[PDB]
Amino acid sequence: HMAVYVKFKVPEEIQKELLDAVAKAQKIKKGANEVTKAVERGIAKLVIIAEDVKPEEVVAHLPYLCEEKGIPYAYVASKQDLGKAAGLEVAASSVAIINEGDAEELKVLIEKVNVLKQ
C-alpha cells in the first residue's frame, strides 16, 4: 500500500493502542473536516488518520498541518475500524482526541509514535 499521505509505518500493535485510545476518549472530533478545524484551532492532542481513505485528498493535507502546528499524528489501517472506535456506525477517515480517557497512556503512546517516525 502506502498512500503518499501515509508518511511512516505504524505497526498493528500500535494501531490497536491508537484505536483503544480513541474508544476510551472523553471528547473526540470525527472526520477530516472536524479534525482539520481542531488542529487549526489547537485543541487536538493527537490525530489518528486511516490508511485506506479514497479519495486520498480527503486526508492528504493532515500530516503537513499537524507537523506545522506541532500536533502528534499517526495511522490505523481501517477507516471502518476508526469509525467504530469513535462510536459511529459508519467510517471515519480521521479522528482528533480532544480530551483523552487516560492521560498517562496518551503521553506513552505519543512517545511511541515519536519514535516510529524518526
PDB file of C-alpha atoms in Angstrom:
ATOM      1  CA  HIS A   1       0.000   0.000   0.000  1.00  0.00           C
ATOM      2  CA  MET A   2       1.199   3.045   1.332  1.00  0.00           C
ATOM      3  CA  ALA A   3      -0.577   6.032   0.019  1.00  0.00           C
ATOM      4  CA  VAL A   4       1.557   9.122  -0.408  1.00  0.00           C
ATOM      5  CA  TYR A   5      -0.152  10.678   2.627  1.00  0.00           C
ATOM      6  CA  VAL A   6       0.988   7.828   4.892  1.00  0.00           C
ATOM      7  CA  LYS A   7       4.418   9.191   5.899  1.00  0.00           C
ATOM      8  CA  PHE A   8       5.617   6.393   8.229  1.00  0.00           C
ATOM      9  CA  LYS A   9       4.620   2.810   9.143  1.00  0.00           C
ATOM     10  CA  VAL A  10       2.713   2.172  12.192  1.00  0.00           C
ATOM     11  CA  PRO A  11       2.590  -1.497  13.016  1.00  0.00           C
ATOM     12  CA  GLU A  12      -0.540  -3.305  14.110  1.00  0.00           C
ATOM     13  CA  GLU A  13       0.357  -3.356  17.741  1.00  0.00           C
ATOM     14  CA  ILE A  14       0.435   0.488  17.983  1.00  0.00           C
ATOM     15  CA  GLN A  15      -2.619   0.693  15.752  1.00  0.00           C
ATOM     16  CA  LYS A  16      -4.542  -1.184  18.350  1.00  0.00           C
ATOM     17  CA  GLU A  17      -3.306   1.134  21.009  1.00  0.00           C
ATOM     18  CA  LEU A  18      -4.487   4.110  18.889  1.00  0.00           C
ATOM     19  CA  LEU A  19      -7.946   2.613  18.403  1.00  0.00           C
ATOM     20  CA  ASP A  20      -8.169   1.874  22.061  1.00  0.00           C
ATOM     21  CA  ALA A  21      -7.180   5.495  22.912  1.00  0.00           C
ATOM     22  CA  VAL A  22      -9.970   6.703  20.604  1.00  0.00           C
ATOM     23  CA  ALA A  23     -12.566   4.328  22.301  1.00  0.00           C
ATOM     24  CA  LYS A  24     -11.777   5.480  25.722  1.00  0.00           C
ATOM     25  CA  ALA A  25     -11.514   9.177  24.906  1.00  0.00           C
ATOM     26  CA  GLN A  26     -13.816  11.646  26.640  1.00  0.00           C
ATOM     27  CA  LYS A  27     -14.071  14.027  23.690  1.00  0.00           C
ATOM     28  CA  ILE A  28     -13.147  13.480  20.062  1.00  0.00           C
ATOM     29  CA  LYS A  29     -13.702  15.091  16.738  1.00  0.00           C
ATOM     30  CA  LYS A  30     -14.571  12.837  13.822  1.00  0.00           C
ATOM     31  CA  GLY A  31     -13.894  13.083  10.097  1.00  0.00           C
ATOM     32  CA  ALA A  32     -11.474  15.248   8.066  1.00  0.00           C
ATOM     33  CA  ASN A  33     -13.387  18.443   8.180  1.00  0.00           C
ATOM     34  CA  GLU A  34     -13.798  18.441  12.030  1.00  0.00           C
ATOM     35  CA  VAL A  35     -10.282  17.134  12.579  1.00  0.00           C
ATOM     36  CA  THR A  36      -8.764  19.828  10.385  1.00  0.00           C
ATOM     37  CA  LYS A  37     -10.743  22.530  12.301  1.00  0.00           C
ATOM     38  CA  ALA A  38      -9.484  21.108  15.615  1.00  0.00           C
ATOM     39  CA  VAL A  39      -5.790  21.130  14.557  1.00  0.00           C
ATOM     40  CA  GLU A  40      -6.201  24.665  13.180  1.00  0.00           C
ATOM     41  CA  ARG A  41      -7.675  25.874  16.471  1.00  0.00           C
ATOM     42  CA  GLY A  42      -5.062  23.938  18.555  1.00  0.00           C
ATOM     43  CA  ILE A  43      -7.399  21.723  20.523  1.00  0.00           C
ATOM     44  CA  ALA A  44      -6.273  18.350  19.147  1.00  0.00           C
ATOM     45  CA  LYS A  45      -3.891  16.439  21.303  1.00  0.00           C
ATOM     46  CA  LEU A  46      -3.439  13.501  18.901  1.00  0.00           C
ATOM     47  CA  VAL A  47      -4.703  12.960  15.308  1.00  0.00           C
ATOM     48  CA  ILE A  48      -5.316   9.424  14.018  1.00  0.00           C
ATOM     49  CA  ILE A  49      -5.594   9.003  10.185  1.00  0.00           C
ATOM     50  CA  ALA A  50      -6.871   5.914   8.365  1.00  0.00           C
ATOM     51  CA  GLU A  51      -4.626   4.481   5.655  1.00  0.00           C
ATOM     52  CA  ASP A  52      -7.414   3.483   3.308  1.00  0.00           C
ATOM     53  CA  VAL A  53      -9.125   6.831   2.601  1.00  0.00           C
ATOM     54  CA  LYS A  54     -10.200   7.364  -1.011  1.00  0.00           C
ATOM     55  CA  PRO A  55     -10.128   9.898  -2.458  1.00  0.00           C
ATOM     56  CA  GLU A  56      -6.786  10.388  -0.671  1.00  0.00           C
ATOM     57  CA  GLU A  57      -7.253  14.185  -0.924  1.00  0.00           C
ATOM     58  CA  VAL A  58      -9.792  13.952   1.882  1.00  0.00           C
ATOM     59  CA  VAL A  59      -6.893  13.461   4.379  1.00  0.00           C
ATOM     60  CA  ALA A  60      -3.735  14.276   2.366  1.00  0.00           C
ATOM     61  CA  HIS A  61      -3.330  17.750   3.925  1.00  0.00           C
ATOM     62  CA  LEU A  62      -3.438  16.449   7.500  1.00  0.00           C
ATOM     63  CA  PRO A  63       0.205  15.300   8.097  1.00  0.00           C
ATOM     64  CA  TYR A  64       1.531  18.664   6.916  1.00  0.00           C
ATOM     65  CA  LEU A  65      -0.968  20.619   9.012  1.00  0.00           C
ATOM     66  CA  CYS A  66      -0.221  18.558  12.076  1.00  0.00           C
ATOM     67  CA  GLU A  67       3.545  18.890  11.700  1.00  0.00           C
ATOM     68  CA  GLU A  68       3.241  22.680  11.083  1.00  0.00           C
ATOM     69  CA  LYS A  69       1.150  23.020  14.349  1.00  0.00           C
ATOM     70  CA  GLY A  70       3.243  20.667  16.491  1.00  0.00           C
ATOM     71  CA  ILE A  71       0.419  18.150  16.856  1.00  0.00           C
ATOM     72  CA  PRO A  72       1.258  14.445  17.093  1.00  0.00           C
ATOM     73  CA  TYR A  73      -0.391  12.216  14.460  1.00  0.00           C
ATOM     74  CA  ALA A  74      -0.353   8.581  13.391  1.00  0.00           C
ATOM     75  CA  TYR A  75      -2.221   5.999  11.323  1.00  0.00           C
ATOM     76  CA  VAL A  76      -4.544   2.960  11.572  1.00  0.00           C
ATOM     77  CA  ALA A  77      -5.317   0.622   8.765  1.00  0.00           C
ATOM     78  CA  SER A  78      -9.088   0.937   8.513  1.00  0.00           C
ATOM     79  CA  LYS A  79     -11.445   3.780   8.342  1.00  0.00           C
ATOM     80  CA  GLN A  80     -14.280   1.362   9.180  1.00  0.00           C
ATOM     81  CA  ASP A  81     -12.448   0.396  12.269  1.00  0.00           C
ATOM     82  CA  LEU A  82     -11.650   4.011  13.138  1.00  0.00           C
ATOM     83  CA  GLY A  83     -15.274   4.967  12.862  1.00  0.00           C
ATOM     84  CA  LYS A  84     -16.317   2.075  15.127  1.00  0.00           C
ATOM     85  CA  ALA A  85     -13.665   3.059  17.753  1.00  0.00           C
ATOM     86  CA  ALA A  86     -15.130   6.601  17.576  1.00  0.00           C
ATOM     87  CA  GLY A  87     -18.669   5.291  18.365  1.00  0.00           C
ATOM     88  CA  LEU A  88     -20.047   5.503  14.905  1.00  0.00           C
ATOM     89  CA  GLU A  89     -21.827   3.003  12.621  1.00  0.00           C
ATOM     90  CA  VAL A  90     -20.034   4.474   9.620  1.00  0.00           C
ATOM     91  CA  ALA A  91     -16.311   5.014   8.743  1.00  0.00           C
ATOM     92  CA  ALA A  92     -14.192   7.873   9.886  1.00  0.00           C
ATOM     93  CA  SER A  93     -11.174   8.970   7.768  1.00  0.00           C
ATOM     94  CA  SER A  94      -9.576  10.664  10.733  1.00  0.00           C
ATOM     95  CA  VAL A  95     -10.135  11.320  14.472  1.00  0.00           C
ATOM     96  CA  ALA A  96      -8.730  14.000  16.793  1.00  0.00           C
ATOM     97  CA  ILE A  97      -8.531  13.236  20.539  1.00  0.00           C
ATOM     98  CA  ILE A  98      -9.554  16.489  22.361  1.00  0.00           C
ATOM     99  CA  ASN A  99      -9.925  15.150  25.921  1.00  0.00           C
ATOM    100  CA  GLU A 100      -8.353  11.744  26.475  1.00  0.00           C
ATOM    101  CA  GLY A 101      -9.533   8.842  28.763  1.00  0.00           C
ATOM    102  CA  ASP A 102      -6.065   8.102  30.235  1.00  0.00           C
ATOM    103  CA  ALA A 103      -3.526  10.871  30.322  1.00  0.00           C
ATOM    104  CA  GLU A 104      -0.601   8.638  31.099  1.00  0.00           C
ATOM    105  CA  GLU A 105      -1.370   6.199  28.326  1.00  0.00           C
ATOM    106  CA  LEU A 106      -1.680   9.114  25.858  1.00  0.00           C
ATOM    107  CA  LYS A 107       1.728  10.554  26.851  1.00  0.00           C
ATOM    108  CA  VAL A 108       3.318   6.938  26.393  1.00  0.00           C
ATOM    109  CA  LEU A 109       1.556   6.376  23.069  1.00  0.00           C
ATOM    110  CA  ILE A 110       2.628   9.870  21.772  1.00  0.00           C
ATOM    111  CA  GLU A 111       6.186   8.999  22.532  1.00  0.00           C
ATOM    112  CA  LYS A 112       5.913   5.618  20.984  1.00  0.00           C
ATOM    113  CA  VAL A 113       4.767   7.368  17.789  1.00  0.00           C
ATOM    114  CA  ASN A 114       7.630   9.910  18.012  1.00  0.00           C
ATOM    115  CA  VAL A 115       9.990   7.048  17.947  1.00  0.00           C
ATOM    116  CA  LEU A 116       8.369   5.407  14.979  1.00  0.00           C
ATOM    117  CA  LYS A 117       8.549   8.395  12.973  1.00  0.00           C
ATOM    118  CA  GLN A 118      12.379   9.022  13.499  1.00  0.00           C
TER     119      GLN A 118
END
